[PDB]
Amino acid sequence: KVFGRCELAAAMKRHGLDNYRGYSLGNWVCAAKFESNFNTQATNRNTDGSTDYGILQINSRWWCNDGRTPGSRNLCNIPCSALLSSDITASVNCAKKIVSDGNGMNAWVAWRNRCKGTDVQAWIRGCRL
């Protein structure tokens, strides 16, 4: 599923990400835009052999099991394929644990390099929230 911007904003708010760990909704929408272009099916291989999955490009070295990332963890206790669903529940629940793990939203490379320190409020402009 390719979410609309305000569509994804509304789904993220419903699942409790607006101001989760202090990060306003626009941060999460901006992160998803540059991680996945709002595409729940997005996957990308990393040089270390891990893969990033879904709307928030959650990585198989730490967070989910894809059966092909040796010596990895599965800290969200979930198959990585669950992160590709049109329903973002699994991705949001896993994202909550990631952003709680010490480094905040810096865990998302695209957020650090493209959203952090910008006017992220613009990402929810016009949305009926």
Ligand X SMILES: CC(=O)N[C@@H]1[C@@H](O)[C@H](O[C@@H]2O[C@H](CO)[C@@H](O[C@@H]3O[C@H](CO)[C@@H](O)[C@H](O)[C@H]3NC(C)=O)[C@H](O)[C@H]2NC(C)=O)[C@@H](CO)O[C@H]1O
The catalytic residue positions are 35, 52
Query: Of 92, 86, 100, which Cα lies nearest the Cα of 14?
Result: 92
Contact window for ligand X (CB under 6 A) among 3-11, 19-27, 58-66, 115-123: 58-66
* Residue 113 near ligand X by CB under 6 A: no
Query: Smallest distance from the beta carbon of 71 to ligand X, in angstroms?
Result: 12
Contact window for Cl ion (CB under 5 A) among 43-51, 74-82, 86-94, 103-111: 103-111
| Residue showing tokens 């939203």 | 105
**101 labeled binding residue:** yes
Query: Smallest distance from the beta carbon of 126 to ligand X, in angstroms?
Result: 27
Contact window for ligand X (CB under 6 A) among 4-12, 13-21, 82-90, 99-107: 99-107
Q: Which of 113, 118, 122, 129 binds Cl ion (CB under 5 A)?
A: 113
* Residue 110 near Cl ion by CB under 5 A: yes
Q: Is 117 left (phi over 0), alpha (psi -120 to 50) or beta?
A: left
DSSP 73-95: --TT-SBGGGGGSSSTHHHHHHH
Identify the burial level of 10 via C-beta atoms within 10 angstroms of its C-beta, where 0-12 means exposed, 13-18 middle and 19 or more buried. Answer: middle
* 79, β-bridge pairs: 65
On whether the CB atoms of residues 46 and 25 are closer than 8 A, the answer is no
| Residue showing tokens 């959203």 | 115
Pick out the residues of the known binding site. Answer: 101
Residue ranges that bind ligand X, judged by CB under 6 A: 52, 57-59, 61-63, 98, 101-103, 107-108
Residue ranges that bind Cl ion, judged by CB under 5 A: 109-110, 113
